Amino acid sequence: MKITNYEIYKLKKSGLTNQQILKVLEYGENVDQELLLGDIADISGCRNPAVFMERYFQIDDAHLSKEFQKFPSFSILDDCYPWDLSEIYDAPVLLFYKGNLDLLKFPKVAVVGSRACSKQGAKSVEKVIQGLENELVIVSGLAKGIDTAAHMAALQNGGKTIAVIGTGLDVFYPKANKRLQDYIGNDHLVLSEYGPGEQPLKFHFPARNRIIAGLCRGVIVAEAKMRSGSLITCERAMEEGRDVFAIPGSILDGLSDGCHHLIQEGAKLVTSGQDVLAEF
Amino acid sequence: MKITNYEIYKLKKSGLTNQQILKVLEYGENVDQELLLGDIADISGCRNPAVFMERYFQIDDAHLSKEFQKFPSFSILDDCYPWDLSEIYDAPVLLFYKGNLDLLKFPKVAVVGSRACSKQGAKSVEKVIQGLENELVIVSGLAKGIDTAAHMAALQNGGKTIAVIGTGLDVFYPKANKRLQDYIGNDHLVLSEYGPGEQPLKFHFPARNRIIAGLCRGVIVAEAKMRSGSLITCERAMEEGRDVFAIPGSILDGLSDGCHHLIQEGAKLVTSGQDVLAEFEFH
Numbered sequence A: 001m002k003i004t005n006y007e008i009y010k011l012k013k014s015g016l017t018n019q020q021i022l023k024v025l026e027y028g029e030n031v032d033q034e035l036l037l038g039d040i041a042d043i044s045g046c047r048n049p050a051v052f053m054e055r056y057f058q059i060d061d062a063h064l065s066k067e068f069q070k071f072p073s074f075s076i077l078d079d080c081y082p083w084d085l086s087e088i089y090d091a092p093v094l095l096f097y098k099g100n101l102d103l104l105k106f107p108k109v110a111v112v113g114s115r116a117c118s119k120q121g122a123k124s125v126e127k128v129i130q131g132l133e134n135e136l137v138i139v140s141g142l143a144k145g146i147d148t149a150a151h152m153a154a155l156q157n158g159g160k161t162i163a164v165i166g167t168g169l170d171v172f173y174p175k176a177n178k179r180l181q182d183y184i185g186n187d188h189l190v191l192s193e194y195g196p197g198e199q200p201l202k203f204h205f206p207a208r209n210r211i212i213a214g215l216c217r218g219v220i221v222a223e224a225k226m227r228s229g230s231l232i233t234c235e236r237a238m239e240e241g242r243d244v245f246a247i248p249g250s251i252l253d254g255l256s257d258g259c260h261h262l263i264q265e266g267a268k269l270v271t272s273g274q275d276v277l278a279e280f
Numbered sequence B: 001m002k003i004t005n006y007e008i009y010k011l012k013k014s015g016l017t018n019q020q021i022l023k024v025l026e027y028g029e030n031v032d033q034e035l036l037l038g039d040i041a042d043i044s045g046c047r048n049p050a051v052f053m054e055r056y057f058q059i060d061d062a063h064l065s066k067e068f069q070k071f072p073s074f075s076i077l078d079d080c081y082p083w084d085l086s087e088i089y090d091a092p093v094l095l096f097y098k099g100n101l102d103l104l105k106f107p108k109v110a111v112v113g114s115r116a117c118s119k120q121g122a123k124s125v126e127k128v129i130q131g132l133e134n135e136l137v138i139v140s141g142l143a144k145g146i147d148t149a150a151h152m153a154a155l156q157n158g159g160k161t162i163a164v165i166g167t168g169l170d171v172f173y174p175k176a177n178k179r180l181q182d183y184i185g186n187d188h189l190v191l192s193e194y195g196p197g198e199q200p201l202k203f204h205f206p207a208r209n210r211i212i213a214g215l216c217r218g219v220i221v222a223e224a225k226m227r228s229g230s231l232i233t234c235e236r237a238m239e240e241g242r243d244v245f246a247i248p249g250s251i252l253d254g255l256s257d258g259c260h261h262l263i264q265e266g267a268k269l270v271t272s273g274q275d276v277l278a279e280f281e282f283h
Helices: A005-013 A018-031 A037-043 A049-058 A061-069 A101-105 A119-131 A146-156 A175-187 A204-215 A229-239 A257-264 A273-277 B005-013 B018-031 B037-043 B049-058 B061-069 B101-105 B119-130 B146-157 B175-187 B204-215 B229-239 B257-264 B273-279
Strands: A073-075 A094-099 A108-113 A137-140 A161-164 A189-192 A218-222 A243-247 B073-075 B094-099 B108-113 B137-140 B161-164 B189-192 B218-222 B243-247
Touching (some): A005 A018, A005 A049, A005 A061, A005 A073, A005 A094, A037 A049, A094 A101, A094 A175, A101 A189, A108 A146, A108 A229, A119 A146, A119 A218, A119 A243, A119 A273, A137 A146, A137 A204, A146 A161, A146 A175, A161 A175, A204 A229, A218 A229, A229 A243, A229 A257, A243 A257, B005 B018, B005 B049, B005 B061, B005 B073, B005 B094, B018 B037, B094 B101, B101 B189, B108 B119, B108 B146, B108 B204, B108 B229, B119 B146, B119 B218, B119 B243, B119 B273, B137 B204, B146 B175, B161 B175, B161 B204, B218 B229, B218 B257, B218 B273, B229 B243, B229 B257, B243 B257
Parallel strands (some): A108 A218, A137 A161, A161 A189, A218 A243, B108 B137, B108 B218, B161 B189, B218 B243
Antiparallel strands (some): A094 A189, B073 B094, B094 B189
16 A cells, blocks of 8 residues: 555554654655555554554544545655754654644744743843844744743744644644644744644643654743753753754743753853844 | 051151052062162152152151051061062052951952942842851952942851951041941951041042952952942953952843843853852862
């Protein structure tokens, strides 16, 4: 069989992990993605090949084809799949989108931070983004706090933004961002690994963060704490050889302890967009 | 003539600069500071040797000896002069003091910053000093703002402080800090290059800063603005091979811009006294 983007989705639905599909596609390369089901089951390295195959055969192709086609997609096999993202560990094998794929061709910068951000924190992000002078596409995860402030700031400056989410492209999270998700979803770009109707499950968020970081050469931090999600994203981005740009804060409040730890560990302290641009 | 501490003061009063006296004392070493006036005038490298010698002879020794003896002193020739301060360019040749010289025997850290700091800036300095756990003598210049908060934090913790002033030991600048200067002079140590009745002249402050930095193995910055006095002290401390520990702040205020610039340039970002202690050069 020819492994198409629909087949990649069908393999995920049959129980194959992203790492298992990566092994299959790695082998399938020098054979033009023309592999037998018994070989796919073998190459994948899954526990019970007979269980995977049974799950594959039980799939109602008519009902799955409708589901797969609800939102457009692209895979690691497609030419449009960005270079920086392919280089990461566990690179997403298939991504569903809503918007203009042309945004993936321009230079990108990630922006992460506190879900419960201060008014100070949000202004700091805006100030840094304005100073970027629309030279970079703002990549963030649409969650409450500085993610929202980073999206809004790139929009107001007359530039372009990419959102990457932890739900299906039809589900909205956080509930308040429905309008903002819909807007970027038309004029800009919203990316997701999750199919229609998939819920904001806890594990989807650290997973989604891997894509935010992976898409960009650098990550901008603001108001990150000592054992926060933003810190984990930056520490993992540093491991992928990506630049971390940390915005400092007060040593009294506790809101910027992660940013300060990152700067001590080698990250670049940033005060303006020019500080970010000087490194890029 | 034998160059004594009184003679060093008399040379400063005759028009010789600190660098000029430093050249004289360097040459005078292998001759046990026994040089004649014509040689002192020559070695110093002053523009007009005849004018220096004239001025030296016009000095009323009785009036000057009373002035010199008003407050005790020590010079670069004395055993008590700290070795770290001797290593700087243009090391003070003579220092007048008020207090306990024993404080010069302990490990010291400089604390510099904004004259017009914020309440957050002062609390940042207090937090970092508290975390030092009285392991270091707090060296600062008695200026309003960060300097005052540095001295008070040392005092409250039950620690020791050294003040380096830009006036005479009987002059108080700023006027509001009189009680603090008087107390530091009583229980701690106040140092000055300036003789009795000398006023807070603008140039006295950058000069005084060279001693604050020179005395210590590290400098702590808080709320240093761009093109500020605190930044200049740190940039020169970095040139002298001293560690600079910068306390970060908001990127909005403009207050911590100098601290942020220093961190970018290689200075250590600090959040506690433990962060300072972790990287501090002791012996």
